[PDB]
Design a protein around this ligand. Structure first.
Ligand SMILES: Nc1ncnc2c1ncn2[C@@H]1O[C@H](COP(=O)(O)OP(=O)(O)OP(=O)(O)O)[C@@H](O)[C@H]1O
Ligand SMILES: [Mg+2]
Lengths: 583, 572
């Protein structure tokens, strides 16, 4: 652990609490009112008890003190009810605003950065770690003022009564914060590793759940139970380590609380008998003095035991903030969010000059790329598997960072507004995914208010309507987890219906006709060939004989484009395309 | 509350620790009440005795009681928490691993009934919700019931009327207030359980779809749906917060009433004397102290509606019976596999049409078979019947002239190698992504199989130790395609099922893979599903399917001469 990092996380945590600054001050004021009302209640009981026990006053003569004692009790229950609701309201406003900040960045991060964590670890970050910050904002922050003012007000109420009792309480207090800080120095790091083990256990579970089919194929049932058992055992041991720190601190602060109550009880008990004579202002120690100090002794340490209890809620939020703050710090695809945007809906021109495409980890995916695709022209990317063809399409989507130059209509891609740039974009990807609930909600992803004529045109062009009668609900049939209801080639054509439903300035095709037989690939390519002519198109494909009308063919090798030109020139000129076409 | 019975039956494990925590919770409370009860009486008894009664008053014994109750209070609570939290999270660890073990037997069809983000919420979040059942329902409730009786019986010696007035109030509070808070919070607790699992499903679905959602502009309207679930979830959270605040306020008023009544009632007389004296402070300070035993009692039942809702979720998942069951008999894996199908029919769950209609084929040992057909014609459904993903309806499948349902599960996985149409890259290291098949393989064998399949660049830098999948490196579509072929070549099973293995591979890479498969898959029964009619001359038999049926079946040469559906695939 590093204290400097922890000091930086506490500053970040304390900044999020500004929105609830009014509510945090109200609970500080209400918590002080509870201290006032517990002193008044202890004073009324002691006065009543002293009169009955020592002066034998009948209970009927004592009616004002009972009236005020009941009134104090009702007021105290009202403040406790108010303070709990005020503290909760402050905490969830901060939690709601912190989660909005996290989800705001996850939108801008894109698929490449969402790859940085398992999807089950993102859920722990957003749900478990933001929710475990509540008690820091709701409880610990108001308590720092109550841990000082309330015990101090208790003592001031006992000096006028007995100065020896007020020194017993103050004689035990100074070791409370030293022991609080001593036990809890490692609590923030134990929480950080607890959330680390929970994110690892959650990310591991959802990863094996999504690959449960491959596990069943290879009979990995016994092995995966042990892998969960290891991850579950680590989480249990990190949870225990957090808990023994909170139990030790709670026990140590209870030791001083109980020691002082015994000390106050013994001091007054021996003082009454005459065993010891000090501690009073030249007057016999009254029974009201003993009862006042006895009732207020546990309440003197309550604000200090609560501070110790909420000191570990602060450590829980600091360990929870470690992973969130790291995500909020890592630079996204482009260092600065672009503000520029292109007005014309006409097909765009792509220029690349010494373009380098890199992963979020800095590994280059495509080497120096130099090409130009004029407006309305269509290009084909072909080459060996693993040569970075898909990285160029992911960089054009705005998902990856690039070091060179990549200009859309002369405007740098990083300067474009990502939301407005994506409205001029449409693509079918490699292994496409269907996020919407039904087949109709998936085709209508680009705009769910499309007409029935526009929807039917996309299904007819994408060759989707042929397998519609097979589905029970038709186009309204749900697709299930990862489109489990559809075959691979059926989900492929549903993703083609998304791309062909809205016009775009640039159309990308990663493997548009993947997992399609010889005939269905022909009908789907009929729609995609006609669609590629309507705007700038960049298609990646392994089919070579089929394409001869495309304006330019790019061949990559090791992330670099090495030949350009039409099919007629490249087919008979040798090089890698002819070698590629030879097979 | 009947759904909590299977989980209260986990007390049998760690019953010595869980019952030790109950005892230490009672002892802690008794010492806590006694510390403040002895100090209230000791001060009043000493004050009444005064200086004159010094020699007649036994002040040493009370001074030992308050000192003794101080350590017992602090030591008991510390150790009560240690034993109770230790046993609780061992129970939750076993419950989590037990719940996870139910998933793979349900993998093909049982898991399709659930959403993946909800299934994640059950195993990690809903199991953890049950810590309330082991930490703060049984120990607080039986701790408060024993302490109330000990207080009531103990005070009964001094006075019967005063003891049952304080004991009646405490006992009535213990038996009437927690059930009231259970009803007021059970509907909120059900929503709170439902809304957290709905938020986790929507968030994981939203995150795993950000490539498509961002481009087609659906991220905002899918985040709005997610942000609306959080509004409801935060509202249910606020509803439970108001119930806790009301519970705390009411507990302060009931305890106030007991103190007020004890002050008023005990003043008249305690045990029949006109002036009780120090005995007034005995009852007043008992009422002031004994109500700390009822503090966790009301919240024990208030949060039970959420615990019952979670326990229903786990119980539903673990009560599912898998559709496919395997014999426990031990069988030897045969070196040669020849499979036979006679009129195999299969209908998917909640469907009316048949995916497979009377499929029948005889594949001799060592044969290589190519399966062709249209998209959605049941090619993948056939290869999954052979894997016992589902039991066929009104059909039979045999391996080596013995039913496929009569094989041990370990023997069935050791006799079939599969290359699925969709390849999953696990979030482990590269070594662990290849140790799925042939766990005993060495790094020399793992490295060589990568060179043969064309993944030599994947051995650079970290290589086998490099982390793959989420949180690590994605392979490309072709690299995933070749990683699955590497997995199946390491399995080394007599029967190999390849679902479009050369998919998304360029012409040169496909030739190298098909050349590698031809060499490695010799004297192996192979059923290879292809959308590419290339090198079909090698296959001893070609199967052409359509709408779940085998239209034409024969050698590559025969299918061209007759000019059937296969000929149109070739040229046309
Ligand atoms: N989980 C499922 N529930 C119901 N029907 C399904 C399910 N999975 C697939 N189907 C349907 O079963 C039929 C055959 O599917 P199958 O996966 O066998 O096709 P396939 O021949 O492998 O297709 P492709 O060549 O596109 O991969 C299709 O109608 C398909 O939509
Ligand atoms: Mg298939």
């Amino acid at each position: 652990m590093n204290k400097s990092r922890q000091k930086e996380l506490t500053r970040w945590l304390k900044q999020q609490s500004v929105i609830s600054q009014r509510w945090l001050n109200i609970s500080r004021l209400l918590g002080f009112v509870s201290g006032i009302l517990i002193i008044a209640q202890a004073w009324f009981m002691a006065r009543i008890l002293q009169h009955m026990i020592m002066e034998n006053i009948p209970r009927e003569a004592l009616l004002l003190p009972f009236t005020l004692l009941v009134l104090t009790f009702v007021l105290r229950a009202w403040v406790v009810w108010l303070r709990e609701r005020v503290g909760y309201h402050a905490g969830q406003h901060i939690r709601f605003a912190i989660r909005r900040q996290v989800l705001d960045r996850l939108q801008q991060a894109g698929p490449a950065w969402i790859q940085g964590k398992p999807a089950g670890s993102w859920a722990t970050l957003v749900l478990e770690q933001i929710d475990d910050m509540h008690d820091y904002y709701a409880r610990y922050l108001p308590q720092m003022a109550l841990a000082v003012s309330v015990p101090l007000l208790i003592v001031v109420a006992i000096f006028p009564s007995n100065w020896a009792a007020a020194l017993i309480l103050l004689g035990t207090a100074p070791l409370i914060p030293l022991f609080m800080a001593l036990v809890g120095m490692g609590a923030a790091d134990a929480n950080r590793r607890n959330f680390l083990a929970l994110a690892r256990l959650s990310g591991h579970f959802l990863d094996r759940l999504r690959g449960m089919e491959t596990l069943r194929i290879f009979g990995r049932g016994e092995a995966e139970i042990e892998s969960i058992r290891s991850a579950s055992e680590d989480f249990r041991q990190r949870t225990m380590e957090v808990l023994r720190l909170a139990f030790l601190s709670s026990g140590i602060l209870e030791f001083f609380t109980s020691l002082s109550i015994a000390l106050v009880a013994v001091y007054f008990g021996f003082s009454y008998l005459g065993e010891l004579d000090f501690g009073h202002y030249d007057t016999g120690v009254t029974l009201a003095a003993g009862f006042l100090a006895l009732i207020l002794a546990p309440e003197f340490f309550q604000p200090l035991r609560d501070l110790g209890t909420f000191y570990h809620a602060k450590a829980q939020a600091v360990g929870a903030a470690d992973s969130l703050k790291t995500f909020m710090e890592t630079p996204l695809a482009h260092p600065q969010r672009g503000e520029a945007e292109l007005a014309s809906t006409d097909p765009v021109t792509i220029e690349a000059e010494e373009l380098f495409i890199t992963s979020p980890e800095g590994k280059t995916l495509a080497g120096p790329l130099n090409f130009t695709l004029p407006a309305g022209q269509r290009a084909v990317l072909v080459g060996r598997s693993g040569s970075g063809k898909s990285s160029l399409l992911n960089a054009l989507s705005g998902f990856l960072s690039y070091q060179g130059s990549l200009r859309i209509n002369g405007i740098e891609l990083r300067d474009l507004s990502p939301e407005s740039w994506r409205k001029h974009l449409s693509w079918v990807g490699q292994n496409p995914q269907l996020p919407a609930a039904t087949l109709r909600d998936n085709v209508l992803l680009a705009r769910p208010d499309a007409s029935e004529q526009e929807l039917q045109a996309a299904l007819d062009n994408a060759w989707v309507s042929e397998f519609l009668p097979l589905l029970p609900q038709g186009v309204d049939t749900p697709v299930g987890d990862q489109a489990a209801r559809l075959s691979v080639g059926q989900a492929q054509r549903v993703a083609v219906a998304r791309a062909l439903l809205n016009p775009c300035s640039l159309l990308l095709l990663d493997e548009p006709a993947a997992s399609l037989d010889a005939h269905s690939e022909q009908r789907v390519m009929e729609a995609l060939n006609a669609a590629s002519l309507r705007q700038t198109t960049l298609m990646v494909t392994h089919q070579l004989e089929d394409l001869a009308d495309w304006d330019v063919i790019w061949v990559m090798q090791d992330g670099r484009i090495i030949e350009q030109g039409r099919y007629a020139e490249l087919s008979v000129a040798g090089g890698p395309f002819a070698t590629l076409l030879a097979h | 509350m009947r759904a909590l019975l299977p989980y209260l039956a986990l007390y049998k494990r760690h019953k010595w620790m869980l019952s030790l925590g109950i005892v230490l919770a009672i002892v802690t409370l008794l010492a806590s009440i006694g510390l403040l009860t002895l100090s209230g009486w000791f001060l009043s008894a000493s004050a009444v005795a005064g200086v004159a009664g010094l020699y007649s008053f036994n002040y040493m014994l009370p001074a030992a009681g308050v000192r003794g109750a101080a350590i017992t209070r602090t030591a008991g609570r510390y150790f009560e928490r240690l034993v109770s939290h230790d046993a609780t999270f061992r129970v939750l660890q076993h419950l989590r691993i037990y719940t996870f073990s139910k998933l793979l037997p349900l993998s093909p069809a049982g898991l399709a009934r659930y959403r993946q983000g909800e299934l994640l919420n059950r195993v990690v979040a809903d199991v953890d919700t049950l810590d309330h059942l082991y930490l703060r329902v049984i120990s607080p409730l039986v701790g408060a019931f024993v302490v109330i009786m000990v207080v009531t019986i103990g005070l009964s010696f001094l006075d019967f009327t005063l003891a049952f007035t304080l004991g009646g109030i405490m006992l009535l509070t213990l038996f009437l207030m927690p059930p009231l808070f259970y009803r007021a919070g059970k509907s909120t607790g059900q929503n709170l359980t439902h809304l957290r699992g709905q938020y986790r499903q929507q968030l994981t679905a939203w995150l795993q779809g950000q490539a498509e959602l961002t481009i087609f502009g659906a991220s905002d309207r899918y985040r709005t749906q997610l942000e609306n679930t959080e509004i409801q979830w935060l509202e249910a959270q606020r509803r439970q917060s108001e119930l806790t605040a009301l519970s705390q306020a009411i507990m302060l008023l009931i305890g106030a009433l007991a103190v007020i009544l004890m002050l008023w009632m005990a003043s008249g007389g305690v045990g029949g004397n006109a002036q009780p004296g120090a005995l007034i402070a005995l009852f007043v300070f008992c009422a002031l102290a004994a109500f700390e035993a009822l503090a966790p009692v009301t919240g024990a039942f208030q949060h039970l509606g959420q615990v019952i809702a979670s326990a229903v979720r786990i119980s539903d998942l673990t009560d599912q019976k898998p559709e496919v069951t395997f014999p426990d008999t031990q069988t030897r894996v045969a070196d040669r596999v020849s499979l036979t199908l006679r009129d195999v029919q299969f209908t998917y769950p909640e469907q009316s049409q048949q995916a497979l209609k009377g499929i029948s084929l005889q594949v001799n040992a060592g044969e290589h078979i190519a399966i062709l057909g249209r998209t959605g014609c049941g090619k993948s459904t056939l290869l999954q019947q052979l894997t016992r993903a589902w039991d066929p309806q009104q059909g039979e499948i045999l391996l080596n002239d013995s039913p496929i349902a009569s094989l041990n599960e370990a023997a069935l996985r050791q006799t079939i190698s599969v290359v699925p149409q969709r390849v999953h890259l696990f979030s482990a290291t590269l070594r662990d992504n290849l140790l799925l098949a042939s766990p005993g393989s060495s790094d020399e064998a793992l490295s060589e199989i990568l060179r043969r399949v064309g993944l030599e660049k994947l051995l650079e830098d970290a290589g086998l130790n490099s982390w793959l999948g989420e949180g690590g490196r994605q392979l490309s579509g072709g690299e995933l395609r070749r990683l699955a072929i590497a997995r199946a070549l390491l399995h080394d099973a007599p029967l190999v099922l390849l679902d479009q293995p050369t998919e998304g591979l360029d012409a040169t890479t496909e030739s190298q893979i098909l050349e590698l498969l031809a060499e490695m898959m010799r004297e192996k029964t192979v059923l290879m599903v292809t959308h590419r009619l290339r090198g079909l001359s090698r296959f001893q038999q070609i199967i052409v399917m359509d709408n779940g049926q085998i239209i034409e079946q024969g050698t590559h040469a025969e299918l061209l001469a007759r000019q059937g559906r296969y000929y149109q695939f070739k040229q046309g």
